[PDB]
Design a protein around this ligand. Sequence first.
Ligand SMILES: NS(=O)(=O)c1cc2ccccc2s1
Ligand SMILES: NS(=O)(=O)c1cc2ccccc2s1
Ligand SMILES: [Zn+2]
Length: 257
Amino acid sequence: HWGYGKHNGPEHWHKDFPIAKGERQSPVDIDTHTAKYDPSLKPLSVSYDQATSLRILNNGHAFNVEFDDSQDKAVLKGGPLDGTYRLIQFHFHWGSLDGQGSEHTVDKKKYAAELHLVHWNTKYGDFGKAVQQPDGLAVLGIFLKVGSAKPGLQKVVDVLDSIKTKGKSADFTNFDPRGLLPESLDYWTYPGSLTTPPLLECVTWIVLKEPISVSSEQVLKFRKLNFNGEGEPEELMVDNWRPAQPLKNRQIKASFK
Ligand SMILES: NS(=O)(=O)c1cc2ccccc2s1
Ligand SMILES: NS(=O)(=O)c1cc2ccccc2s1
Ligand SMILES: [Zn+2]
């Protein structure tokens, strides 16, 4: 299977997932000078008032906080999007060190981690059908920098010792993902892909300009998770990010001047 090790990391993924070398791969470097302000972009609409978290899962590559997406209860709209996208899960990517971990970069700067809120276009009925479409998904990306704690993150960090290893899950109800957002919803957007296999080219990326602040202690607890299963040689879950991919003349658009 693919992963983030020496032998099965991002430079290997093309051998089983040839779209790895495609025309709309993610993540990318965001060259802030080349991204054009688009005054036709709308404010993003994040409506998470009724979000229903269910469970947290260590899938062997990250942890996913899963949501009940059987009704329109946590949706993203507006911004560059046509239509309504339902939140299905969020997860992060992070580094072994604070100097690396994010997947998108900004003028080649790497943040310590990046949060992805994954949503699917309700016109396609469910997530598995949406990932077959070029406008199937909208992923809201938020950078994390190390500084002051994010109080809304702490319930996620507190549960991680219960899902240390691959395949472990834990009930995770009543979690409010609004506590993970920054103040501003200014963003960049471009067309791209899932950043892990199967690397499908189905995502409208919406990357917020303003990072959130998490504490050193918060991110250290992410780095105590394991890629391995219980009873297996410990391999710390660190450096589960794909590096920036060729932009291939796509345009990155800014919502702000
Ligand atoms: N990264 S991958 O192309 O999916 C992959 C599968 C795989 C299996 C055994 C050893 C290395 C790799 S690399
Ligand atoms: N990292 S991501 O592009 O947000 C992502 C979401 C996602 C969902 C199902 C399977 C693979 C991936 S990879
Ligand atoms: Zn991701």
